[PDB]
Structure formats: C-alpha cells, structure tokens
Symmetry: D2
Subunit: 252 residues, 4 copies
Amino acid sequence: MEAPAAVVTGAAKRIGRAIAVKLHQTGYRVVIHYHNSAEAAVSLADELNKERSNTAVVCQADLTNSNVLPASCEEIINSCFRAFGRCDVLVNNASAFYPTPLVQGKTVETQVAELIGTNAIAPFLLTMSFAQRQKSNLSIVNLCDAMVDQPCMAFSLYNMGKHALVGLTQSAALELAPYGIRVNGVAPGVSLLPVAMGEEEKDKWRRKVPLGRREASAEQIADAVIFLVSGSAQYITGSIIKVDGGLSLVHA
Amino acid sequence: MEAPAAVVTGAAKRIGRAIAVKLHQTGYRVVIHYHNSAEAAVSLADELNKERSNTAVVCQADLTNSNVLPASCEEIINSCFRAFGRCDVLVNNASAFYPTPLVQGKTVETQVAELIGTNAIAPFLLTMSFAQRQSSNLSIVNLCDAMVDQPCMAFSLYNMGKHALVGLTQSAALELAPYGIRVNGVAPGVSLLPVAMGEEEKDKWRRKVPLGRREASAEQIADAVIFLVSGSAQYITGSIIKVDGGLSLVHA
Amino acid sequence: EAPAAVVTGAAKRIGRAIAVKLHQTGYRVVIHYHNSAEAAVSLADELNKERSNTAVVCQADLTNSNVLPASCEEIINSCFRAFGRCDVLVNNASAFYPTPLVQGKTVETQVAELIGTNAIAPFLLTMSFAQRQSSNLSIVNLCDAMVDQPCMAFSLYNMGKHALVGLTQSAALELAPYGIRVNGVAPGVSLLPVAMGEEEKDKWRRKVPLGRREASAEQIADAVIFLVSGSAQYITGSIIKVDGGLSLVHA
Amino acid sequence: EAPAAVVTGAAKRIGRAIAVKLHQTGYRVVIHYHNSAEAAVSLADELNKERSNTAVVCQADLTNSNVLPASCEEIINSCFRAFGRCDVLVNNASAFYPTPLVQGKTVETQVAELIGTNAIAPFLLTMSFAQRQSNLSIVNLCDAMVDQPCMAFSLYNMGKHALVGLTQSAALELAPYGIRVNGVAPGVSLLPVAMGEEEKDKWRRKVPLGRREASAEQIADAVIFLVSGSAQYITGSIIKVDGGLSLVHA
Ligand SMILES: NC(=O)c1ccc[n+]([C@@H]2O[C@H](COP(=O)([O-])OP(=O)(O)OC[C@H]3O[C@@H](n4cnc5c(N)ncnc54)[C@H](OP(=O)(O)O)[C@@H]3O)[C@@H](O)[C@H]2O)c1
Ligand SMILES: NC(=O)c1ccc[n+]([C@@H]2O[C@H](COP(=O)([O-])OP(=O)(O)OC[C@H]3O[C@@H](n4cnc5c(N)ncnc54)[C@H](OP(=O)(O)O)[C@@H]3O)[C@@H](O)[C@H]2O)c1
Ligand SMILES: NC(=O)c1ccc[n+]([C@@H]2O[C@H](COP(=O)([O-])OP(=O)(O)OC[C@H]3O[C@@H](n4cnc5c(N)ncnc54)[C@H](OP(=O)(O)O)[C@@H]3O)[C@@H](O)[C@H]2O)c1
Ligand SMILES: NC(=O)c1ccc[n+]([C@@H]2O[C@H](COP(=O)([O-])OP(=O)(O)OC[C@H]3O[C@@H](n4cnc5c(N)ncnc54)[C@H](OP(=O)(O)O)[C@@H]3O)[C@@H](O)[C@H]2O)c1
Ligand SMILES: Nc1nc2ccc(C(=O)NCc3ccc(Cl)c(Cl)c3)cc2s1
Ligand SMILES: Nc1nc2ccc(C(=O)NCc3ccc(Cl)c(Cl)c3)cc2s1
Ligand SMILES: Nc1nc2ccc(C(=O)NCc3ccc(Cl)c(Cl)c3)cc2s1
Ligand SMILES: Nc1nc2ccc(C(=O)NCc3ccc(Cl)c(Cl)c3)cc2s1
C-alpha cells in the first residue's frame, strides 16, 4: 500500500529500536530484524501495531558470514515485500562488537565470520538484494563508527569490518545512483554504552566528549538516520555524517 | 520577540539567499549580509518583512582580508544583536572563487586577501565575535567544498582557503563545545552554476554527477544547513556533510 | 646476520619487484605463491645464484576458509625455518575483479577471494608474524590510492582494501609496544592487469598528472624499501600513495 | 654540478636537520632564517668547511604583507644567484602559538604570522620556484595532528590545513612541468623551548612507538626520501612521521 516501508537490522533494542520507532513515527511500515532478541522484537512490533495496525513485522536471521548468508539476506528483503508490497529504505544497523587481540572461546574463523559478516558482508548482500528487488525516495543508511581512524586497542577485526562498511557506502552510492538509490552512513562516537560496562568505565568515556561530556542518546542517532532518508537529503549520496559530540577531534 | 536570529553572509543571491529564506521560513529573524549586491539584499529583506514585520535587516561589508576586517566582522555580529537582541546562528557562506595560476589584473596580494579573507579569515573573525558575544541552540555552519581533495586546476588559493575552513570548523567545534556552540559544515559539489556559463559547459559538469546528472539546487544545500542548526542535530559538532550527488566519489 | 622478509604473491609483477629489491638490499626472502610455481622458483634460482641459500619458496592459497589460519601460520613458519628470524612481512598478494551489485563464481566464493586474500590473510599473517616475535621489524600492506574514488562495480574489492587500511591502523597501534611498525603503500595505476585491453590502458595512463604513464613495479617497491629501512624508524600507521597524482584528479 | 635546495627556517631544530641531511646527500643549500642570524651563519660555516661554496644564508620575514611576494621571490632568487639552479624547496618555517576564540599582538598580526608563515609564504615560494624553471620537487612540513588539533590553536590549524590544500593543488598543477609536491607531517618532534619538562613528558607518554618524540633527524629522513630518485612517481602525498600518535583516541 501507500505508506513507505523500511527494513532495520538488529532492531529489537538500543539504537536499531530507536531508528525503527522514529521511522514508524514518520509514517513508515517497518520490518524489525533480530537474531537472538525474540521477546524484545515481538514486544516492539506489538507496540507499533497497537499504534497503527499491520505496520510492523519481525524477521529472524543470523548475519554471521556463511554460505547461506546470501539466502538469509535475500529473505530479510523478501519479508518486507511479503508484508508491505515494497521496500523503500534499508538500515544496516546490526553489528557484532568485541576484541580480537593480535597477540593472544571462539575460533579465529568464527570471529572473522561474525565481525566481518555482521559489519560488512551482510550489509553488502542486503544491499544487492534491496537493489535487485526494485520496481518515491529509495535509500540505504549504514551505521558506521566515527572512531574508525582512532580505533580501540585490540579491536582489529571489528575495525576492519567498519572500514569495509565505509567502502561499501561509497561503492554502492556510486553504483546505485543511476537507480535513484542513495547510500549514506551515520557514524556514532559513543552512544549507548555496552550493557556489560561498569558505570565507572562509562564515565571515563563520557568525560572525553567535548559536547556535554555525555554519550549520544539513541534518539540523537536515529535523528540523523531520519534526515538521510528524508526528502531534505535528496541530493545526498555517499556521505557519512558523524554524530559524535566532537569525540573524534580530541587528541590523545 | 522569542524568535531566534541568524546572520548569513553573502545572502543576497544564489545559495546564501536560499539559506536566509529557509531559516526565515523556519522562524528565524535574519541579518542579510552583502558586499556588492545592495539591490538584491534589500529586495530579499523587503520580501521577508512582508511575510513577517521586522524579521530581516541588511548589513553591508567587504570580507577581504585587511587591517579593518576584524572591526567589520565584529560589526556584522553586533548588527544582529542590535536588530534582534540575540544571535543564535552564524552561516559562513560568502565566498570569492576564481583561478590563481602558479605559473604565468589583480596583484597576487589582492588575490590572497580576497580568496583567503572571504573563505577563511572572515569566517574565523566572525566565529570569534559570535562566541565573544554569547532553550538555547547556538551553532555555526560553514559552507565548505566537497571537491577540496580533487581540486579544479589552477585554483590553489581558493582551495587553500576552503581547506583552512575545514580546519576552522574542527578547531572551533572543539573549542566552543563547552559554551554549547556547535560548529559544522555543508560541502556542495556542483550546485548553482554561473548564469553566463554556456549550457554546453554547464552540461559537461552536470554529466559528471552520478545522482541525476544535474547540479544541486540552492534549496538542496539550504536543507542540509537547516538540518545542522535544528534540534535534530544537537549532538552533531565538527561534522561536514557533503551534498554532492556522489560527485566526489567519481575517479578521473 | 642478514634480516629476512616474507613477500606474498611474489612470483610476478609488483611482489616480484618487491622481493628483488629487498634481496638487493640484503634481505633473505620467502617468495610466496599460489598458482605461479614455475615463476616463483625461477625467481628463487635467480636470487640464490646471486647469494646462495638466500631465497626459498612457499606455496599457499590465500582464499578465506577454515584452513587459512593454518596456511598463514605456515608462511610465517617457513621464514623462521629457512632463516631463523622474520623481520619483514609484505602483504602484497591480491585478487581483483568486479562484483556488480545488480546482475561464474558464487557470491560467497567472491567474498572468500576478494575479502580473504586482500584483508583476512593480511590479518592472520600479521597475527602469526607478531606471535612469533637492535631489530627493525615491520609490516607493509599493499593498499590502493583510489579507495575513495572506486572503480564502478568493484564493491567487494573496495571493501577489502578499505578493511586493509583499518588493519594497517589497528595493527600499527597494537604492535607499536613490540617495536613492530605497520605501514602501507598505495599504488594508483601500476602494471595494468594482463587481461585489460591496450585501449583501456592508454585511457588510464592519460589521466595520470605525472608523465601520463603507469608506475613501474620498481617505483612501488622503492616505497616499500623506504618503509622497512632505518630511515622510517619513527613511521607507523602511515600509508604512502605512489600514484603520480592520479587520486587528485576530479571527474 | 651539484643540485641546490632552499630550506626555510633552517637555522635551528628541524629545518637545520633537513639542511644538514640535504647537504650530506650532495645538495648545495640556502639556509633561510628570520631572527636566528648567529645560528644560520654558524651552520653555513659548518657546511662550507665540509665542501666550500655549498651553503649561503638568506634573511626574510615570512609574515603575510603586501611585500611578502617580493620576499619569497628573493628567497628563490638567492638560490639562483649563489648556485645557478634551484632543484628543491622545503617549506619548513612556521609560527606556532595559541589564538583563543574567546578572550601583545593584535588579531590582524596573529593572522598575518600564522597564516603567512604556514600557508601564504609556502604558496608564494612555490609560485616563484615554478616560474624560474631533472628531479625537481617541493616538500611542505605539515602536521599529523591537523584533524585532532590542540585546544585554542585555530589560526595555526587553519594555516596547516591550507598547506595540505596547497600540497594537493600544486602537485596537480606542476606535474606537467616535472615538479613533484609532497608533505612530511610530524606528530610530536622537538618540543617547544618554552615548554616545561612535565608537559613534554605528558606528550611523550602518548606516543605508541617508543613513548618519545621524533628526533629532528627522523623528520629529515622522510624529506630526503621524497626529494630522492626513489620517490619519482610520488606527488600529492603526505607522509606522517608520528610514531602512531594520530591513531590514539582521546
Ligand atoms: N553504541 C555505540 O556507542 C556505538 C558507537 C559506534 C558505532 N555504533 C554502531 O551503531 C550501531 C548500533 O549500535 P548498538 O550499540 O545499538 O548495537 P549493539 O546493541 O551492539 O547490536 C545491535 C544488534 O546487532 C544484532 N547482532 C549482533 N550479532 C549479530 C548476528 N551475528 N546476526 C544478526 N544480528 C546480530 C543483535 O541483535 P539481537 O539482540 O536480536 O541478537 C544486536 O541487538 C552498530 O552498527 C554499531 O557498531 C554504536
Ligand atoms: N555554486 C557551487 O557549485 C558551489 C560548489 C562548492 C562550494 N560552494 C560554496 O557554497 C557557498 C555559496 O556558493 P554560491 O555559488 O552561492 O556563492 P557565490 O554566488 O560565488 O558567492 C556568494 C556571495 O559571496 C559574496 N562575496 C564574494 N566576495 C566577497 C567579498 N570580498 N566580501 C563580501 N562578500 C563577498 C558575494 O556577495 P555580493 O554579491 O553581495 O557582493 C556573493 O554574492 C560558497 O561558500 C561556495 O564556495 C558552492
Ligand atoms: N597493479 C596496480 O596497478 C595496482 C593498483 C592498486 C593497488 N595495487 C595493489 O598492489 C598489490 C600488487 O599488485 P599486482 O598487480 O602485482 O597484483 P596481481 O598481479 O593482481 O596479484 C599478485 C599475486 O597475488 C596472488 N594471489 C591472487 N589471489 C590469490 C589467492 N587466492 N591465494 C594466494 N595468492 C593469490 C597471485 O599469486 P600466484 O600468481 O602465485 O597465484 C598473484 O600473482 C596488490 O595488493 C594490489 O591490490 C596494484
Ligand atoms: N616540532 C614539532 O613537534 C612539530 C610537530 C608538528 C609539525 N611540525 C612542523 O615542522 C616544521 C618544523 O618544526 P620546528 O619545531 O623545527 O619549527 P619551529 O622551531 O617552531 O620554527 C622553525 C623556524 O621558523 C621560523 N619562523 C617563525 N616565524 C617566522 C616568520 N614570521 N618569518 C620567517 N621565519 C619564521 C623561525 O626562524 P628564526 O628562528 O630564524 O626566526 C624558526 O626557527 C614546522 O613547519 C612545524 O609546524 C613540527
Ligand atoms: N555494535 C557495537 N559497536 C560499537 C562500537 C563502539 C561502542 C562503544 O561503546 N565504544 C566505546 C567503547 C570503548 C572501549 C571499549 Cl573496551 C568498549 Cl567495550 C566500548 C559500542 C558499540 S556496540
Ligand atoms: N563561491 C564559490 N565557490 C564555488 C566553488 C565551486 C563551484 C563550482 O562551480 N564547482 C564546479 C565547477 C564547475 C565549472 C567550472 Cl569551470 C569549475 Cl572551475 C568548477 C562554484 C563556486 S562559487
Ligand atoms: N591485485 C590488483 N589490484 C589492482 C588494483 C587496481 C588495478 C588497476 O589497474 N586499476 C585501474 C583499472 C581498474 C579496473 C578497470 Cl575495469 C580499469 Cl578499465 C582500470 C589493478 C590491480 S591488480
Ligand atoms: N612550528 C611549530 N609547529 C608545531 C606544531 C606542533 C608542535 C608540538 O609541540 N605539538 C605538541 C604540543 C603542542 C602544543 C601544546 Cl600547548 C602542547 Cl602541550 C604540545 C610543535 C610545533 S613548533
């Protein structure tokens, strides 16, 4: 029907939820993708459907790289067409994030599949599927990282995956421009800190941020996604907007 | 009375005009700075005042580097406070743009004063005067250039000024973040081309743009300015948003 | 006495010029190869005629798989076996071909080759090299000066070269404590793909500001030699373009 | 004969180590200086004692003004007068001090010194160099920290950003004349004379590769590479020589 539709990956919680909520408030129908967070995904879709019925569905998939990842990414895009008859927007938000020291219970090949698959390869396959299933304001927004050039110690694979995501953003903006598909990124600095992190460590990171000495709210991240998908960004493609309160400008 | 106020330099025509219009449509009172274009600046102020009385004034100043530039820039900022009692937004838009070949009727020192004054020095002095004078959403937007790393041939002084403006955007974002003043840029690729440029040459440039094979409208550039000054960008500082249709991604 | 270097993809073209120039500088070299056995041995024979027992070959497929970590460990081990030390790693081997987003290897094979060979193998080699460690230890990654203005329909290739920039910076930071420097060399057009038409080749040569020609392989190798030398002992996390200005040229 | 190089601000510290190392490589040198007349003439004496007639000094103020173009023309002229050629220009001279946005020198003077020395004088020297024209090249001393700048150094940071633009624009424009243009970007090298030793140590401790500043010689080594025949295909490149400092997050 006549409301546009969006896919948001890793949308059960945290930033991906804030993006799906804000898209839904702007008038989109949404596919809430999730991996393990089944209860949180269904609860969000229920909340959205209560606000406007038949406007949210969930879709489960592991985005770890394997020989079936192309099928799973094809299926995520397929689920948006099955529910809503169209797919206007793809938000690549799902991400694995953990250290992989170079000088050192997962195997290294599992670490590569997870950190490179979720951060880079699944975005590429979803982009291919999104583009191939096209028949309006079509675009993709990749969630990138403002600190990719000043990386955390011992996170090489995660950093490699986020750099690859910058290259995807640029390559796909170039190649999909003739189809009228825009491809942009939003690059948080510190936003919602990891659930595992102690308050004392959270505050150490907060104190580094020039603009307010605090992390970004999930909603502040979502605001920049909403801008890039909007008609106010219709000439914008291949741009990555930092939303980092100045953190990347701060020297050691 | 409770409306915020903005200074836009070089606002009589083209991009600066569209930025002043869009700020006014959003509810800002505006200072329309101009250098030579008196009749166009006053025409715009009159059109805006017809929409809402006493919401637009003009301010004449040459932004060429000289001994008097600091006083001129102080006076532009002062004009905003005298008209409207506050100054919430500064837009550094005014720009000289012409070739300065390295190998061979203005002298080179005049080219330096104009190209480095308008593009860099005047922004710095206006940023100083804006900050010295300071519900609040204070910010500065500098009009940058998406092609600064792939410059037009024989434009070294222009390119130097626009790189210096990147540095200003970054340095002032860091330094003004404790005052709650955000500093950002918008970087066009090809937007409004010269009226007197032959269509055949205009088309050579338009054909290079992946997204639509056309230049950006002034309004499309103004849209990204409006985003950055808005409450939707309240964690964004030190960022430069390209608005270039993918132009900067295209190899030779 | 003499230091030792591993050069991946060293049988031909750029990696060959790198191995030769390292050898000429006094390194012992491990010439890695995948399919190019005859050429790898040919170069080792040429080097060993110059100084005996200074060049060995090492076969390995650098495609991503469950066995890549073991293959990468073996490349590094081969250097230690032959020469008792490994001072320099040059990650030069690379797959290069288009992978259009909008439509034969399967996609997941193109991922294994383009991301495995250009990024994951460099990462695992870097891990094996650091694990096995006065001296001047460093790693040099063969990057691409055109990574921000990529060729149309080369997304996987571009992703892998961007990942290789991130590896260069992450490993430079993490290995600095061990005195291991990590840097890159980023060619523009050098030796054009054998596949490529002559007409397409001249089209590209014409774009290059500095002399309207491609880099020779030895011009690339010159920047590698600089980065491994004692004249670069404070340089880590740097990527030196060697592109004749190509990446400065607008559309 | 031997090639000739101009090194601006060559009396002391990094510019001095660059002049020494070019001279050791074979070059005749113009040692440009502003205030450091004793140190300039003393280096030139040292170099000439090694090889007679291979070093001269040239005094000039690189502050921006309507006579800066004549002064930069004079610097290039002095190389031609002494040596009959000018193969290499090193833009090393630089003013460096804070210019806070929120409040001895007027702001017009701070702009003229920080933008003139770091950017305008390089541009004018590049113009004069190119206009008077084997292995010709220019090397600009940039700054590895330009995107993670010191607090309250906007004018300095603006100048160094402009110098990056100059390096790119001049590389593009001079390539058809066979002139290469590149940069060397130190992180922390010889720390300011004015700085206390506790602040010097805070900076040293930030550097991943060795927890120490670059020697002036290590900066000069990269300059030597870029002017050498081993960098003949290199133009528009800026080499960081920063021990990883620019990689370290806040
Ligand atoms: N939070 C920050 O400060 C910050 C900073 C920089 C960049 N970012 C970027 O912003 C985005 C969102 O940040 P965030 O903190 O909201 O992310 P997050 O909570 O770390 O992860 C978001 C979701 O990713 C999904 N995910 C993880 N591994 C997966 C797999 N193998 N298959 C499928 N899905 C998987 C998970 O879904 P389930 O829970 O359903 O398993 C998870 O809820 C990410 O791209 C991130 O890298 C965030
Ligand atoms: N148009 C494009 O494609 C494009 C591309 C990249 C970047 N940009 C940037 O976007 C901004 C707006 O572009 P535009 O094409 O609208 O600019 P423009 O028409 O070239 O110039 C804007 C105004 O700048 C003012 N200006 C010029 N020299 C001045 C001086 N010495 N003192 C004071 N004001 C002076 C002039 O005002 P008066 O007319 O009143 O004298 C002029 O109308 C500029 O910063 C530009 O560099 C534009
Ligand atoms: N040529 C250029 O203009 C250019 C431009 C930009 C960047 N570069 C970078 O420069 C480096 C060298 O360039 P080049 O033109 O010399 O490279 P190339 O000829 O395309 O490839 C070099 C060698 O890489 C090895 N290789 C490819 N796939 C492999 C796999 N799955 N397993 C193991 N080895 C494999 C091959 O070795 P075998 O032959 O033994 O099978 C090949 O001979 C590359 O990293 C490249 O991306 C080159
Ligand atoms: N040292 C570092 O850590 C570091 C870090 C990043 C970048 N850099 C860059 O590397 C280069 C060399 O560094 P450095 O520490 O050796 O420089 P420095 O000691 O601060 O300055 C070099 C020389 O510049 C000259 N100079 C200053 N103002 C001048 C003017 N108005 N006219 C003419 N000359 C003037 C002075 O010459 P006289 O003494 O003859 O007056 C001075 O000796 C500079 O471009 C610098 O910005 C250095
Ligand atoms: N998928 C995700 N990507 C990222 C990227 C960055 C951050 C973030 O919070 N970074 C600050 C941070 C800094 C250091 C450490 Cl050790 C940790 Cl665990 C977290 C958190 C996340 S969650
Ligand atoms: N103050 C101004 N700054 C700029 C910056 C860039 C452009 C612009 O037109 N860029 C594309 C372009 C189009 C045509 C020609 Cl001939 C050239 Cl040199 C450049 C136009 C302007 S007007
Ligand atoms: N392993 C390798 N990596 C690279 C990277 C770039 C090039 C190169 O020649 N690029 C220019 C170019 C690349 C692709 C095409 Cl289709 C055309 Cl026509 C021209 C060649 C190679 S070989
Ligand atoms: N002409 C010159 N340019 C530069 C650029 C940077 C440095 C340097 O010392 N940077 C480190 C540093 C710079 C400024 C301060 Cl306030 C402190 Cl504490 C530490 C020193 C110089 S001297």
